[PDB]
Amino acid sequence: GHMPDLADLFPGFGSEWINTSSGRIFARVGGDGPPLLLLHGFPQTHVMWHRVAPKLAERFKVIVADLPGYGWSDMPESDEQHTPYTKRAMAKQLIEAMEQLGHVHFALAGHDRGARVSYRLALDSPGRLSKLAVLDILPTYEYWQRMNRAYALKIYHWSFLAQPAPLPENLLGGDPDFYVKAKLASWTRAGDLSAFDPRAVEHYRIAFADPMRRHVMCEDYRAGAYADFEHDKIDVEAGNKIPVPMLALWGASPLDVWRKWASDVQGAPIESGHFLPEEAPDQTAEALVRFFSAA
Amino acid sequence: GHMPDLADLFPGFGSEWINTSSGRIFARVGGDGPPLLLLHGFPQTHVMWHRVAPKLAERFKVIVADLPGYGWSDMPESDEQHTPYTKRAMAKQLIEAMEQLGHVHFALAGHDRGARVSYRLALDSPGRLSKLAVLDILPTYEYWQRMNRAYALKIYHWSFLAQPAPLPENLLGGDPDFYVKAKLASWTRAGDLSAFDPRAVEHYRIAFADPMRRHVMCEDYRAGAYADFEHDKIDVEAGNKIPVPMLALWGASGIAQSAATPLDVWRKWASDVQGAPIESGHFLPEEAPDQTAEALVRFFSAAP
Numbered sequence: 171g172h173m174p175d176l177a178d179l180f181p182g183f184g185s186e187w188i189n190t191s192s193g194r195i196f197a198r199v200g201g202d203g204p205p206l207l208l209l210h211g212f213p214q215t216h217v218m219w220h221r222v223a224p225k226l227a228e229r230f231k232v233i234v235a236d237l238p239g240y241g242w243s244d245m246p247e248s249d250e251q252h253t254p255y256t257k258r259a260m261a262k263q264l265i266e267a268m269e270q271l272g273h274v275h276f277a278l279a280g281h282d283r284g285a286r287v288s289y290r291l292a293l294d295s296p297g298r299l300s301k302l303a304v305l306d307i308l309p310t311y312e313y314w315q316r317m318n319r320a321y322a323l324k325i326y327h328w329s330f331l332a333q334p335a336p337l338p339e340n341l342l343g344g345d346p347d348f349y350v351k352a353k354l355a356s357w358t359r360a361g362d363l364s365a366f367d368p369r370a371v372e373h374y375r376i377a378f379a380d381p382m383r384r385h386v387m388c389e390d391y392r393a394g395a396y397a398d399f400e401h402d403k404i405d406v407e408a409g410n411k412i413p414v415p416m417l418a419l420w421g422a423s424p425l426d427v428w429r430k431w432a433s434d435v436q437g438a439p440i441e442s443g444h445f446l447p448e449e450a451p452d453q454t455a456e457a458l459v460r461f462f463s464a465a
Numbered sequence: 466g467h468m469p470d471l472a473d474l475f476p477g478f479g480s481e482w483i484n485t486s487s488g489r490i491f492a493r494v495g496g497d498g499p500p501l502l503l504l505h506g507f508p509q510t511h512v513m514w515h516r517v518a519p520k521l522a523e524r525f526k527v528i529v530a531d532l533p534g535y536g537w538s539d540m541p542e543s544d545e546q547h548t549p550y551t552k553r554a555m556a557k558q559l560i561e562a563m564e565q566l567g568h569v570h571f572a573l574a575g576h577d578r579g580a581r582v583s584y585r586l587a588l589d590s591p592g593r594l595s596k597l598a599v600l601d602i603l604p605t606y607e608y609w610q611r612m613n614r615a616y617a618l619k620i621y622h623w624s625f626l627a628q629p630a631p632l633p634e635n636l637l638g639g640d641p642d643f644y645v646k647a648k649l650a651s652w653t654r655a656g657d658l659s660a661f662d663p664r665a666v667e668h669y670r671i672a673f674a675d676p677m678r679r680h681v682m683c684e685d686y687r688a689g690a691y692a693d694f695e696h697d698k699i700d701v702e703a704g705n706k707i708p709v710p711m712l713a714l715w716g717a718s719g720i721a722q723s724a725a726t727p728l729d730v731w732r733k734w735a736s737d738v739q740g741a742p743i744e745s746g747h748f749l750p751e752e753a754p755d756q757t758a759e760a761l762v763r764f765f766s767a768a769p
């Protein structure tokens with residue numbers, strides 16, 4: 171009874187609680203063949219890939235993991251530098267998890283915060299990856315460098331969530347169900363929850379209802395403002411590029427920027443707002459299947 | 466029996482609820498001399514002037530007003546453009562209020578959002594003012610143009626409170642007393658509530674405890690993100706400067722200096738401006754009441 175019995179949106183996938191030095195990672199695992207790790211972002215959990223994972227599982231062993239501190243993954247204790255929720259740390263932790271499942275090398279697709287873990291994994295540890303896909307992001311450095319009135323208004327959560335504790339936590343506690351649903355709706359093409367399966371929304375809501383989980387989200391954004399930015403800035407200053415074959419997808423509702431950060435990148439627009447795998451599952455799955463099958 | 470227990474922080478001053486075409490303006494009115502309108506900002510009310518008002522009332526008729534929608538003033542119905550909470554509209558309204566009190570021309574000092582009302586007033590209706598003081602601000606256009614990562618983090622509330630309704634309102638409802646005391650403390654030099662009279666804090670707290678009053682604050686910030694920014698941009702593009710003799714005061718540890726050295730910014734916006742730093746964070750008349758009152762008396766008074 172320690173865990174809620176939430177809807178199973180991955181028919182035929184197993185569940186794994188995977189040990190790491192920083193705590194357990196929860197993942198759904200399905201299909202067969204070369205490993206493909208899929209990483210969600212904010213304010214979601216692993217279930218965001220439920221529409222695309224079955225298609226990918228035709229050809230790959232699909233591992234659909236909750237980020238450190240998200241969903242059902244354990245929440246390592248943070249520190250003043252937000253270390254465990256930096257993308258650098260998260261990437262190392264997910265490397266440990268993949269090794270547990272038997273995979274020293276793997277393919278990787280990330281959305282939103284998961285995409286940030288992914289490109290950072292690729293900068294830090296490019297030998298681990300065969301191919302990388304990033305969905306609907308630019309690097310953290312780029313979002314901060316382009317900070318201005320327009321961006322401040324559009325990605326206000328980058329500055330609000332990064333305020334020192336307990337400011338955002340105290341505020342999010344006063345109607346979390348509203349916040350999580352507003353955050354999802356606001357970044358869809360439709361501006362409502364129509365693109366999401368209601369059962370997925372319930373996963374997202376249940377996670378966001380726990381104050382400890384909301385604290386981790388804020389630690390993630392604090393890292394995003396400070397250590398993750400600094401990590402990125404070091405790469406920019408040395409002109410470091412990802413050498414891994416890369417695919418950037420983005421919602422038409424970015425390749426030039428990615429070509430500054432990667433020496434082998436393909437890209438495509440998807441008719442979607444932010445949540446590509448749920449708003450445009452067929453187009454997203456087709457793009458990923460093609461890219462990861464070329465190897 | 467609905468009025469909360471709130472201290473009278475202006476011994477001897479009258480209390481007026483002043484009619485206008487957009488709602489009543491609440492003010493304390495004291496002293497003797499030519500008129501000086503004092504305008505607070507966020508998340509405060511007129512009571513923030515309580516440490517400097519007596520000194521100014523030795524030479525001036527001091528009118529200490531709650532901004533439209535704030536404190537005890539009425540809350541005008543807003544619209545999609547947040548019109549009545551735009552600085553242009555608040556200025557027109559406070560002009561109506563001064564005319565009701567019998568003052569067609571007056572001197573004006575503002576702090577924070579009240580200072581934004583003040584310089585907009587000076588741009589729009591310069592013939593109304595004899596002299597203008599703005600406390601711990603730069604123009605709204607200037608804060609937006611300087612909104613890089615560091616300043617986005619420092620003044621995050623500019624983007625947060627400007628989100629579409631009801632998002633900030635629903636968040637603030639979560640622990641409003643923590644939020645207001647957090648804002649008050651964080652913008653001080655000491656980083657705590659030591660600079661404030663606890664009786665004043667209770668005024669701020671009671672105001673902020675009302676969801677309707679918080680909604681007005683969000684509307685102000687929305688105006689600040691949209692229409693107010695666009696009005697400023699028009700003036701910048703045209704080269705329009707404030708002609709009214711002007712004083713910019715700012716905290717050495719305040720908000721305005723975090724963006725830029727303030728006097729050189731104000732010289733771009735105004736043709737006769739003087740300025741000086743005060744040893745203080747953002748809340749100059751409460752953190753540094755003797756220095757602030759002296760600066761203001763010397764600037765507004767013809768006597769040395």
Ligand code: NI
Nearest residue numbers: 171172173174
């Ligand atoms: Ni259990």
Ligand code: NI
Nearest residue numbers: 466467468469
């Ligand atoms: Ni009563």
